[PDB]
Amino acid sequence: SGFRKMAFPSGKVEGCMVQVTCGTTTLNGLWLDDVVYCPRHVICTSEDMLNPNYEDLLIRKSNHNFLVQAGNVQLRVIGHSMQNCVLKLKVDTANPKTPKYKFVRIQPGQTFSVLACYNGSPSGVYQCAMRPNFTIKGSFLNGSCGSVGFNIDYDCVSFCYMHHMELPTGVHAGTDLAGNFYGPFVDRQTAQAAGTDTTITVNVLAWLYAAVINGDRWFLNRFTTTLNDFNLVAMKYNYEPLTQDHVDILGPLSAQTGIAVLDMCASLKELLQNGMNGRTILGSALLEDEFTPFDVVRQCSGVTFQ
Amino acid sequence: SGFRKMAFPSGKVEGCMVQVTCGTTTLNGLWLDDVVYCPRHVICTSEDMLNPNYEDLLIRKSNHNFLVQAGNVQLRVIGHSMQNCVLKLKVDTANPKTPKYKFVRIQPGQTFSVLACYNGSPSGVYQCAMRPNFTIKGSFLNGSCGSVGFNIDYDCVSFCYMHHMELPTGVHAGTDLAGNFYGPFVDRQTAQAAGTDTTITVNVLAWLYAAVINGDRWFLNRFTTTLNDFNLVAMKYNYEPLTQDHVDILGPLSAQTGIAVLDMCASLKELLQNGMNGRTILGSALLEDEFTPFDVVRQCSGVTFQ
Ligand SMILES: *[C@H](O)[C@H](C[C@@H]1CCNC1=O)NC(=O)[C@H](CC1CCCCC1)NC(=O)[C@@H](NC(=O)OCc1cccc(Cl)c1)[C@@H](C)OC(C)(C)C
């Protein structure tokens, strides 16, 4: 028993991280087979930050302008191209540690593990969710760009995030590994703001099921509610609408605990309306929304990865 | 900016995990050089759980009773010995992935990363602290015994925990890697209980400094307090005494933020006495105590590991 924000083991991703240096800018890159992926703003200069034309910027560059370092071994760049907001550096050496991998663009509400890196060296790993406003509440300092977020499915690493920038509110913006930003953000030094965030309702319900699996039942009740009437309460408290498709995803957890989905909704309703009254759930005094139904089942059941 | 429960990258430890099977018991082992470490209760049988004599149990065993599996490759046991509550299985193959490593016995209040494993396969990684009562609030199911907890210092993995058992309150008990239990626990199936826990005061203060580093100051005040008068408040709220040595460890954080240690103590005093009044600190509505001063400096500054 017990319940923790669990990240995936990071070994398979640690073996892919490299240092990419260009001009006075150093950040991280992801070395898969003979390609190194990294944010295109590596080619920006301190006076280019404001409104760069990366097409102009890149056609002025040579391969030897890109210092790529894999540990104590420098990799030679033999080609470069830009795809959306990511740079792809063709190198002469294939990474022998390249895992089986996929690139995936995730939906808001999905969670992933971030391997925070600096200078091609992993610093730490933690768990994030893609917020409904397409930011992530990460932990990122200067030098961390090009750190990736990922999920592991048996032996396959699904890369879903690459870090690019920090917004004034202290949340983080980035792209998928094909360089498309999550959300309306752009890699320009211009006034941009998160957008109003909302709480991920389906995830909070997953976490309440995790609490029941783990022996907290103080928040249950005998009441129930309709999906319509639940969503009328949610919108008041700035939660996302719960869809029937969400209900269905919560099927297994409902079946394993014997608590109908809409019965858990009535519990959440009263928690929203009355607060927790000095009590905690899974060691939290807030309603937690960065575990998906899948995360709960993985951790409360014991799924591993080779 | 941002602040997350960060675990260490787990790659170096993932390469050391193996499956150890004996009789009807399967758990994890740690393969370093030509030795596999694992809990001695692997030799227990379902009727031995109650009060085993492991010396008797072990002298009845043969090397070929120990199934050790490293992925799809079985390792041959060529010797075995017991050290305190851990078994050391001598194998004929040295692990080529053996990192530079140390075994260390940590003090309560120190944090570490746990690589939760099942069947020799890592499932996930999360961050724990050794509670003042020498339990850990882990996340562990059947099969997880022999999962290790660890810290990384540049390139060196310091192993500090190996998982053995779960207590009725749902917290977890285990040993250092030389087999000495943390706390008064024993590997017998007998009535044992955690002991009253307390909050790790020096860590809460470290976390409040992390919040200031990250832009929350709502909880500060102009007051101050003496160490004596602070500790008189702490004991009332079931916090551990703050020592002058704790004050000294908080020196750098005090210096980087400009907030004298005892000034932060006066903030904690009023948070203890008035609660947070619907506000949060670093996304928590509770006072967080599982970041050490060192953890805060590592994450707010950017230290990595090769
Ligand atoms: C990559 O190592 C670095 C990682 C950042 C630094 C701090 N934490 C992080 O996550 N990324 C950047 O520094 C990034 C650089 C590129 C270069 C030009 C093209 C896009 C950005 N810059 C930022 O993250 C800045 N954020 C930002 O520009 O947000 C939009 C914006 C632009 C202009 C004005 C405003 Cl008010 C807002 C960060 C460094 O700036 C602040 C944190 C101060 C907002």
Ligand SMILES: *[C@H](O)[C@H](C[C@@H]1CCNC1=O)NC(=O)[C@H](CC1CCCCC1)NC(=O)[C@@H](NC(=O)OCc1cccc(Cl)c1)[C@@H](C)OC(C)(C)C
């Ligand atoms: C190893 O894979 C496993 C990991 C446990 C299972 C569930 N979560 C975990 O962390 N460890 C055990 O199952 C361990 C087995 C050894 C075998 C004999 C020698 C010591 C224990 N058993 C336990 O963890 C049990 N806990 C326990 O025995 O606590 C002290 C105790 C003993 C007797 C009676 C009581 Cl009331 C308390 C667990 C499995 O038992 C409960 C979780 C039900 C307390």
